[PDB]
Design a protein around this ligand. Structure first.
Ligand code: 891
Length: 345
């Protein structure tokens, strides 16, 4: 039945959680670390801030829950629990999400230094494993960066940050990590983008782990494209046709043409197989980028690749994305998803 909830003021909000969650402590809606006495796990508990304040917000809330409930993979963030203190739909106003407490993100691990090749193999392998599973469900991360990759002591990695509001124009401006890992087509809105935007991001991450340095640290959007094009070459006629934005295409043709650089001269001392893979991921034309499934099969991951141990996901119905509903309707849909939740084994 319904557990007993207890109340507590933490990060400026009154948190109301089942008794099973103890020793709540703020770590940054807002988030608390806790001990789940029922599982023995240290957990992170997110209370969503005004989850139903607008259609936009109620729909984002539904998206996040839908996304988190679908994820059942070792290398992807999973939902341990979701709850509301509410007894009915009419009383329903607050949503709490529970996941594993993560130790350190990839920024904490890389920290301005090169990693050993085997460490890079292992980390990128797991990212690609998780991405294969995510992409098989037609889900795109869109925001892959080191701060969204959490790792434990054994270097066991999970992809985080699903259904978030996604960064506004102001936090994509300037010399910012929020933009350095974004594919060019999505950074400058060239065209309708596909799953391989995430592969660009993996390339940027993998290069950073190899060299200890941000690959494309642009001071702004234009600076960044210039760094990108200096490495990968200016686009050919084939790709230009695909840039459906006429203004964007017009700006590209203004730039002095440049050939693709020799990656072995850029990533000096690196595994030739790492270099080869980097070249296949950092392809300007998204149509020609390596997929997660293809990259897992690349010779660079010979020691980890197991086709029988790289599962796909169940189908994810996202028809709701193109649906127009009122706040109360997204709220009722969200409520059904809270009450129907079945905890992992
Ligand atoms: C000390 C840090 C290391 S870090 C930043 O993960 O690298 N630990 C940690 N662990 C897990 C989360 C989960 C978060 O968000 C959630 C997402 C889905 C949920 F179901 C529940 C959540 F709380 C979150 O916002 N933070 C800040 C977290 N922090």
């Amino acid at each position: 039945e319904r557990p007993t909830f207890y109340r507590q003021e933490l990060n400026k909000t009154i948190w109301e959680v089942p008794e099973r969650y103890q020793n709540l402590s703020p770590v940054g809606g807002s988030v608390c670390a806790a001990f789940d006495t029922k599982t023995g796990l240290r957990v992170a508990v997110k209370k969503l801030s005004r989850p139903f304040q607008s259609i936009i917000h109620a729909k984002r809330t539904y998206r996040e829950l839908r996304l988190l409930k679908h994820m059942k993979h070792e290398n992807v963030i999973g939902l341990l629990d979701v709850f509301t203190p509410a007894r009915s739909l009419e009383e329903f106003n607050d949503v709490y999400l529970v996941t594993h407490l993560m130790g350190a993100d990839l920024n904490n691990i890389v920290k301005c230094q090169k990693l050993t090749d085997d460490h890079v193999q292992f980390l990128i392998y797991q990212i690609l494993r998780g991405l294969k599973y995510i992409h098989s469900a037609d889900i795109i991360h869109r925001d892959l960066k080191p701060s969204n990759l959490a790792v434990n002591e054994d270097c066991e990695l999970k992809i985080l940050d699903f259904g978030l509001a996604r960064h506004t124009d102001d936090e994509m401006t300037g010399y910012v990590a929020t933009r350095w890992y974004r594919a060019p087509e999505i950074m400058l809105n060239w065209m309708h983008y596909n799953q391989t935007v995430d592969i660009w991001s993996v390339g940027c991450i993998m290069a950073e782990l190899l060299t200890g340095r941000t690959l494309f640290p642009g001071t702004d959007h234009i600076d960044q494209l210039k760094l990108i094009l200096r490495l990968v070459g200016t686009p050919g006629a084939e790709l230009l046709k695909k840039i459906s934005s006429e203004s964007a295409r017009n700006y590209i043709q203004s730039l002095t043409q440049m050939p693709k650089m020799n990656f072995a001269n850029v990533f000096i001392g690196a595994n030739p197989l790492a270099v080869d893979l980097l070249e296949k991921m950092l392809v300007l034309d998204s149509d020609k980028r390596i997929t997660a499934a293809q990259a897992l099969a690349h010779a660079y991951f010979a020691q980890y690749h197991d086709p029988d141990d790289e599962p796909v996901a169940d189908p994810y119905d996202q028809s709701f994305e193109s649906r127009d509903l009122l706040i109360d309707e997204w709220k009722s849909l969200t409520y059904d998803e809270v009450i129907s939740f079945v905890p992992p084994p």
